[PDB]
Amino acid sequence: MRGVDTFLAFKEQADLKTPATLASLAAGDFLAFNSESLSGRQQVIQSRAIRRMPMRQIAYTANGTVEAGGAVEFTTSNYVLKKLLPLIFHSKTGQEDDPDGDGATFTLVNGGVLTPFTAFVGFDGPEGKYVRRFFGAKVNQATFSARVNDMLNLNLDVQAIGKDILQPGDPGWVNVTPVYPGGDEEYAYVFYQARVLIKAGDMADLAELPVESFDLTINHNLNTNRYRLGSIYRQSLDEGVTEVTGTFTLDAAVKSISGPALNLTGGTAHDPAFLEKVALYGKYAALKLEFIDPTREVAEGVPCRLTIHLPFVRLEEPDFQVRDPGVITGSARFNAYETISVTHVAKF
Amino acid sequence: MRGVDTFLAFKEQADLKTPATLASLAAGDFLAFNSESLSGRQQVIQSRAIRRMPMRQIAYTANGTVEAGGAVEFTTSNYVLKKLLPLIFHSKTGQEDDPDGDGATFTLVNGGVLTPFTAFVGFDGPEGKYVRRFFGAKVNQATFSARVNDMLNLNLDVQAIGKDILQPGDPGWVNVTPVYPGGDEEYAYVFYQARVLIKAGDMADLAELPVESFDLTINHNLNTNRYRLGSIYRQSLDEGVTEVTGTFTLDAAVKSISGPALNLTGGTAHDPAFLEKVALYGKYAALKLEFIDPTREVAEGVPCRLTIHLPFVRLEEPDFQVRDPGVITGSARFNAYETISVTHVAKF
Amino acid sequence: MRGVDTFLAFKEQADLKTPATLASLAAGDFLAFNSESLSGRQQVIQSRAIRRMPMRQIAYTANGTVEAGGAVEFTTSNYVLKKLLPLIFHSKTGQEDDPDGDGATFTLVNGGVLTPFTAFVGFDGPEGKYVRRFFGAKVNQATFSARVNDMLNLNLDVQAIGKDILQPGDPGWVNVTPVYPGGDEEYAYVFYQARVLIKAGDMADLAELPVESFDLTINHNLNTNRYRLGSIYRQSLDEGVTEVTGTFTLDAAVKSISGPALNLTGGTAHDPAFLEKVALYGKYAALKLEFIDPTREVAEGVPCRLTIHLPFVRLEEPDFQVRDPGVITGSARFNAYETISVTHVAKF
Amino acid sequence: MRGVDTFLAFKEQADLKTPATLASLAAGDFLAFNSESLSGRQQVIQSRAIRRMPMRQIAYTANGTVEAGGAVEFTTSNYVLKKLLPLIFHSKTGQEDDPDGDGATFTLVNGGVLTPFTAFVGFDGPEGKYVRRFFGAKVNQATFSARVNDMLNLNLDVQAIGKDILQPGDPGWVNVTPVYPGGDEEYAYVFYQARVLIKAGDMADLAELPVESFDLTINHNLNTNRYRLGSIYRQSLDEGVTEVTGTFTLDAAVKSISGPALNLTGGTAHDPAFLEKVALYGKYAALKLEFIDPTREVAEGVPCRLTIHLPFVRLEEPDFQVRDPGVITGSARFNAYETISVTHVAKF
Amino acid sequence: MRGVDTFLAFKEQADLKTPATLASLAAGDFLAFNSESLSGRQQVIQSRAIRRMPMRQIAYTANGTVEAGGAVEFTTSNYVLKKLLPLIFHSKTGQEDDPDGDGATFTLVNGGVLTPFTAFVGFDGPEGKYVRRFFGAKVNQATFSARVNDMLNLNLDVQAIGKDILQPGDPGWVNVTPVYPGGDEEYAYVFYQARVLIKAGDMADLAELPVESFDLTINHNLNTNRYRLGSIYRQSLDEGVTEVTGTFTLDAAVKSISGPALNLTGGTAHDPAFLEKVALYGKYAALKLEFIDPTREVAEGVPCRLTIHLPFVRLEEPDFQVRDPGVITGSARFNAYETISVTHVAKF
Secondary structure, eight states, X not given: OBGGGOEEXXXXXXXXTSOOOTTSOXXXXXXXXXXXXXXXXXXXXXXXXXXXXSSOOGGGEEEEEEEEEEEEEEEOBHHHXXXXXXXXXXXXXXXXXXXXXXXXXXXXXTXXXXXXXXXXXXXXXXXXXXXXXXXXXXXEEEEEEEOTTSBXXXXXXXXXXXXXXXXXXXXXXXXXXXXXXXTTTOOBOBGGXXXXXXXXXXXXXXXXXXXXXXXXXXXXXXXXXXXXXXXXXXXXXXXXXXXXXXXXXXXXXXXXXXXXXXXXXXXXXXXXXXXXXXXXXXXXXXXEXXXXXXXXXXSSSOEEEEEEEEEEEEEOOOXXXXXSSSOOEEEEEXXXXXXXXXXXXXXX | OOGGGOEEEEEEOSSTTSOOOTTSOOTTTEEOEEEEOOEEEEEEEEOOSOOOOSSOOGGGEEEEEEEEEEEEEEEOBHHHHHHHHHHHSSEEESOTXXXXXXXXXXXXXTTOOOOOEEEEEEOOSXXXXXXXXXXXXXXXXXXXXXXXXXXXXXXXXXXXXXXXXXXXXXTTOOOXXXXXXXXXXXXXXBGGGEXXXXXXXXXXXXXXXXXXXXXXXXXXXXXXXXXXXXXXXXXXXXXXXXXXXXXXXXXXXXXXXXXXXXXXXXXXXXXXXXXXXXXXXXXXXXXXXXXXXXXXXXXXXXXXEEEEEEEEEEEOOOOOOBOSSSBOEEEEEEEEOSOOEEEEEOOO | OBGGGOEEEEEEOSSTTSOXXXXXXXXXXXXXXXXXOOEEEEEEEEOOSOOOOSSOOGGGEEEEEEEEEEEEEEEOBHHHHHXXXXXXXXXXXXXXXXXXXXXXXXXXXXXXXXXXXXXXXXXXXXXXXXXXEEEEEEXXXXXXXXXXXXXXXXXXXXXXXXXXXXXXTSTTOOOOOOOOOOTTTOXXXXXXXXXXXXXXXXXXXXXXXXXXXXXXXXXXXXXXXXXXXXXXXXXXOEEOOOEEEEEEEEETTOOOSSSSOSOTTSOSSOOTTHHHHHHHTTOOEEEEEEEEEEEEESSSSOEEEEEEEEEEEEEOOOOOOBOSSSBOEEEEEEEEOSOOEEEEEOOO | OBGGGOEEEEEEOSSTTSOOOTTSOOTTTEEOEEEEOOEEEEXXXXXXXXXXXXXXXXXXXXXXXXXXXXXXXXXXXXXXXXXXXXXXXXXXXXXXXXXXXXXXXXXXXXXXXXXXXXXXXXXXXXXXOOEEEEEEEEEEXXXXXXXXXXXXXXXXXXXXXXXXXXXXXXXXXXXXXXXXXXXXXOOBOBGGXXXXXXXXXXXXXXXXXXXXXXXXXXXXXXXXXXXXXXXXSOSOOEEOOOEEEXXXXXXXXXXXXXXXXXXXXXXXXXXXXXXXXHHHTTOOEEEEEEEEEEEEESSSSOEEEEEEEEEEEEEOOOOOOBOSSSBOEEEXXXXXXXXXXXXXXXXX | OBGGGOEEEEEEOSSTTSOOOTTSOOTTTEEOEEEEOOEEEEEEEEOOSOOOOSSOOGGGEEEEEEEEEEEEEEEOBHHHHHHHHHHHSSEEESXXXXXXXXXXXXXXXXXXXXXXXXXXXXXXXXXXXXXXXXXXXXXXXEEEEEOTTSBOXXXXXXXXXXXXXXXXXXXXXXXXXXXXXXXXXXXXOBGGGEEEEEOOTTOSSOEEEOEEEEEEEEEOOEEOOOOOXXXXXXXXXXXXXXXXXXXXXXXXXXXXXXXXXXXXXXXXXXXXXHHHHHHHTTOOXXXXXXXXXXXXXXSSSOEEEEEEEEEEEEEOOOOOOBOSSSBOEEEEEEEEOSOOEEXXXXXX
């Protein structure tokens, strides 16, 4: 088996306890991934009765509860986002390829819930065919990462109810053919399209920051321990409170590339302790991570675009340590507070 | 001091509390090792009485209990095994160099106990002569490791009662000369002699697995905390339940090199999810780690051989992650259940 | 032994692990080569056990894993290509000597694999007869080179599983007589038959470039490290992703010999920064390396021909350094992207 | 294109990110060079998503960050120095052609910075006209070399932000005519004008060394890796610490041509281990590389002169190996420590 | 200074840390050499404290640890060997000029050590007198080389503790006069006296090989990094394990000049794949490099002779590449295993 012999497919299922059938997979369900580490784990229960025994005996063990899930890395692209953003957020308004050019907005809602899906990890090649199926899956975490000389990456952390294998001859077995978007229809988001804009204090507009990298994790804190007496499986994946944190690396005392000067008073003079003072006075900033593809247009003059709005964010001490006589660089961590909104304008 | 200036010697002592004498060492007691890290440690007790003091004062400290032991690595060889297998297992039946060619079998027995021994780490050279003696030693763990382009390694984890130094002029000092087997009498077990055979489900015979490496730890879980009021030494090293775990690295959806096809039904068709299904259905497999030296014969046609039988083994999710577009490889951990049996056929 | 006393022979074997027999060699298996450097290499394992020793002792060494392979240079000719092109590419459609004059096309296919073969390097003469046999061989790299006042050369880089020697008295020994094509049937491809044509931007047709030389390497990136415990041999030669790079030397600001003018807009005016702009704007060009032999015809009016199509190619900064007051010359490296197609029209 | 068809021009730009216009070039901007190797390089990013593919596909590549720069060799002359010394050093005091005859002194200052410039490499001739423009260029290294039967050479190593091509019809295109100094106004510095003077220990004055050649590199250690998310270009070329090293070849146990005797005590007796003892006792010497043109005078009796003061220098083991029965010769490397000062007295 | 103005002298010192005095040099200490490259090197430590500075400042540097040593080439001769063989090997038995004609045998012993010596490189002539002294020197490597139309060469690689210069007026200065053996007493070993004999498999005696050249390196792997806090000098030169490798160039499928036929079975028929099969089957051969001077006799009929016994040697793939249609020639590398023994029979 080689990695190229495997296909990944997500399929939104109706209920958490009813897997999607292998026969329902179609176009848009198959995703190209960088790596997947989904696996199941079962507990082994040993009897506590005292017994003289050199090793552990087969007659006194029982199979305990079952866990499942893992990580999947993606290269955030046209169709990857179309598939996965509905799985990460609670609501969606609009269509990405809308002709007016407003795209689809994904947000968290008060009593919102996550869509459960079935993750298929199918195989093929000289050895034979079989499909790992992870039913009742939910997205526990989602990290957006942007580095230089890289593409926008998305690392999902999935929690499923259970795993099972499917093979030729099984009842629900169907010979699926992975169908993917053409090379011309699909495109990725690259580092040279990224923009990080900040706005704290009495700044009038968002000012662009020269950052070297950025991360953004949406953590849904699923309750992965709801077990029952008559079952070995999880009985739910209840989503807790969503923690939206992140990071970005930049230099100390940086000026803005565009927009107003970084000044907590709205003045024109640059503030060399801007981020340090934002972290030290407990002020709330407004981040905006934006990817724009000008070569591609959704409307007459509307470009394809992925935007992440964080209207209320609290920075931590930016970590501008003097390590050596070079340029002082560091990473500024933050926590998003009130709302998170992802807009995706794209043509498929 | 250089490593070549040191000798290691194990000497089986009668009782746990009576060290072997330096004068009793003879041929077969001295072993060639890759490395040893045996050391003693004593506790320092501070008085809890309140006292104004900038630092800790000498008058209010006392010496507490004493620990000892460490690790010793060996290149599993002819004589290394002859010496160490009786120290790792509870029973032994037969002689390795028996002319019929059945070798000696080492197993764990119900009320079995471990042999205590004295480990001597002697030194020599320009600096002078002295011997570290670790009395009341027992084997806590023993890991067999086989890599490619390597020899079979054995890492012992020893727990002793105490340490003491011996020097010219001490009462029990004797000038020992390490005596080792000739280069022609002694031989090691190499990677190209190894065979890993499995058998699960309704398979008829053991099928050979192409594995890249394998590990096997026998953990005796000694109770290393039996202390007494009138003594600083451990009062026993009570052996708990023996945990026999292991690992082996191989590719995903591997066929067998020899024997029946890997199929949990005994059929002829190959099963690409064999190990995954074994781990997922909680089935018990039968491992066999075997080293055969055909160039060396114990009887008319019986070759020297080291075999490890694990008739009942439970695999964990084999860890066949799709990390990249190359070959899918992973490590399959397991736990042995009912019995462990090591057979050693060798001529000395 | 003189070079003229040696013969080379490639024999396509069925499986990677089953060498071809010396008795199966026939016409077309024997190839005339410029040079061969195929050799085997075995690892020597030293025991890590500490031992006082001035030098390394025989009793504590073991033979490790085995490598094989090397390079073979050929003068790309009628029969050399007929033999070797099936070994370099995954698919072949048609026959070179087809009467319609379309020749055979060799391309890489998605799940394609390389043909394993056995390379015989036999000897003869006053000393005696013996044959080096390299079984399980695969083509790792293949470089086509064209210089002025030279013939088209082909340098193969071979990776085999192992080597073995055959001599009179061995079981599989047969007295082979190298049989080669007549001097009239065989012909080579010379420098004055070469044509390099390019096409980038909005150019309508392929324009001929006056180049001084060109190279083209097809690198299959075989995985030459799949080793196993119970064996000293490689267990496979898995082919990775094929890297098709190349080079050609030419002058700076060259006009085309024939075809449209070198202009990324399709105009008639010559563009003196054509290749520099192609490299600087990241444009994809279409190369065509073609050898035509008009004196030799396959059909009524179809000449023998070797063509290499590279429909998508990315140039690097052409390296047009001003080194002195003479003509500015340099080498333009490139990487082929989507597909590679070699057509061979030839009569045997 | 021939080398004589090309012109080089340096133009000091105001900011690092604003190229100089082709219309601003005037007299003194065009320099005669021995050779130039300035070029740009862009990174190609491949998507890490797994995909079955024989070669690399166009749809899954992106253009990464951009590098630029290279080397330019000059024959250190009247105007070459006038142009380039301000680009190599941080400060300048005075005018070279000052009538008092003190010339201009170039030194490194504590918080000093390097002047960014735009390097134009224009072309012309039968093929057509186009200009390579390297904006945001800085001098990374500068090596002064003096050999026998040669002229003083200067090899610059330039680091730029990016490259771009200019052609008739572009917006910023202007038909520039290279204007150079007359043959009578311009002159070079030759080997027979050089003087190397040393002074270590308690020597009273500088003593002249008979050296065969000398080199002097000023390395500014620019930080060429400051990249940003929203851009493919370098965001700065921050200059680190300037390393001033060098070399000079001479014989072993050389006497001084003029000045005091080479004696670390200031005595009159010659010291045959002078340089060996300077290197072995870690002493600091004072070098002076001086070129004097007596035929040319700036004031009534002040000759044109290029002087390089290295008041604190540490030699390495002079490398006076006994290679054969001839004269023992070797090269003495050194590192300059506290300051470097270049004085240029010249009339234009 | 000319090479003829220099003298080399080795003087065996008692301890590694006590240099030999210049007054102790006598006859036999002075050696004629082809070339010497012994030199010292001191480390320069820079302070890591951050400081604004254009260049490196004198006040913040310190002198670090000191290295010494280099290479010396000799023409292996009567007295050169008498002096140097005791420095390369651990033991010596007998006298070279013994009247019975058995010479002296030099071997490596288990706990053997190398003799430390002081190397003087003195100078003289018009410039003045001074002596480089390298104390605590040891032989790290020693390569014996024999080419055609050459003399037996010996290249030593020396590691010393430190260097120092001596001059008239120093305390330990003495005016030494190099005293050398007469031209009649001294003689060298030439290529036409060499014999390379091999013996592998079941061969009965040693068979002579027609080789074009041979090399033999004895590498003692000294530990040259034993440094201490309170000192800038190495604290020891601990000798590791001695690696004895070598090479010899010869033709492919060579017959023996004298002795039994090259046949791994002891038969009379010549084996054209002898060395290839020795390398491919991992067999151990027995080399013997012998120089005999029949014109010179130590006893009534015993000739002066230098013999190197390598009773256990492992060849590598002899490198018999078919490069062209001429004679197939190559170099056979090897590693010596168990022991090395050098016998020197000579009259002085």
